[PDB]
Amino acid sequence: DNNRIISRLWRSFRTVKEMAADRGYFISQEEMDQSLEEFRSKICDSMGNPQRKLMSFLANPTPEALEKYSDLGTLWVEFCDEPSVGIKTMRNFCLRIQEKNFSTGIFIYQNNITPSANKMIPTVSPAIIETFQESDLVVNITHHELVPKHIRLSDGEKSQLLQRYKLKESQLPRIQREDPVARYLGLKRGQVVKIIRRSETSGRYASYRICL
DNA sequence: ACTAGTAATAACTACTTTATCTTTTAAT
Numbered sequence A: 001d002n003n004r005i006i007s008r009l010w011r012s013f014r015t016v017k018e019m020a021a022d023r024g025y026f027i028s029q030e031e032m033d034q035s036l037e038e039f040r041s042k043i044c045d046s047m048g049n050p051q052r053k054l055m056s057f058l059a060n061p062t063p064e065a066l067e068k069y070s071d072l073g074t075l076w077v078e079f080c081d082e083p084s085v086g087i088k089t090m091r092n093f094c095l096r097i098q099e100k101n102f103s104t105g106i107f108i109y110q111n112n113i114t115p116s117a118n119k120m121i122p123t124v125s126p127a128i129i130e131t132f133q134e135s136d137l138v139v140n141i142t143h144h145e146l147v148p149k150h151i152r153l154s155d156g157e158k159s160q161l162l163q164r165y166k167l168k169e170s171q172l173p174r175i176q177r178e179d180p181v182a183r184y185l186g187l188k189r190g191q192v193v194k195i196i197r198r199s200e201t202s203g204r205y206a207s208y209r210i211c212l
Numbered sequence B: 001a002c003t004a005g006t007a008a009t010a011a012c013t014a015c016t017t018t019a020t021c022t023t024t025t026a027a028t
Helices: A002-022 A036-043 A063-068 A087-099 A115-119 A155-165 A180-185
Strands: A057-061 A075-079 A104-109 A128-133 A149-152 A192-199 A203-211
Touching (some): A057 A063
Antiparallel strands (some): A149 A192, A192 A203
């Protein structure tokens, strides 16, 4: 069971690294191709107990992502040591985010999170905090065959689409904020994503969805 | 001293709602 837990944790860590890379943050090539043996050597102790605090890391946007998107800052990924998430731990994490001027931060829990923790999540302005479940991060959803590629559009691209189609913001097809693809991409309200899809009538098709 | 008008005598599926629960938090 310990080996299964370690393998699942390594898969979740790889999925988080891939998600950070897809968002435009720079991840080193050696870290992306980290093997299971290296992860167990540098994280697990002699008794095999995982070190959740050691997995927390920091990432910065690439210059290409910097010029493409002007709203990207520093990224901090933290893994909760304990299974449950009390209000005190969330307050401590929010204080750390405020004191370490992080633009965005990803918090990952094991079992569940208290509703009081979700009560105060809009009180972290200007920073943005996202909550993820580790068990939900075992398998990368974006690698599924049924899930096409989503690319977040810039403000200029969204504007150009709007004058090209003579549209309003509410007339576009809509994508929910709780959509797992939207949560993977960290979508915010009013942001449009372009989707390239296979089609049996024309080969390639392009769709656009605006976040709710 | 009699008569006739005359008026009153359904299951299937879904949503919504309620009370129950209880876990949560700060208070004993």
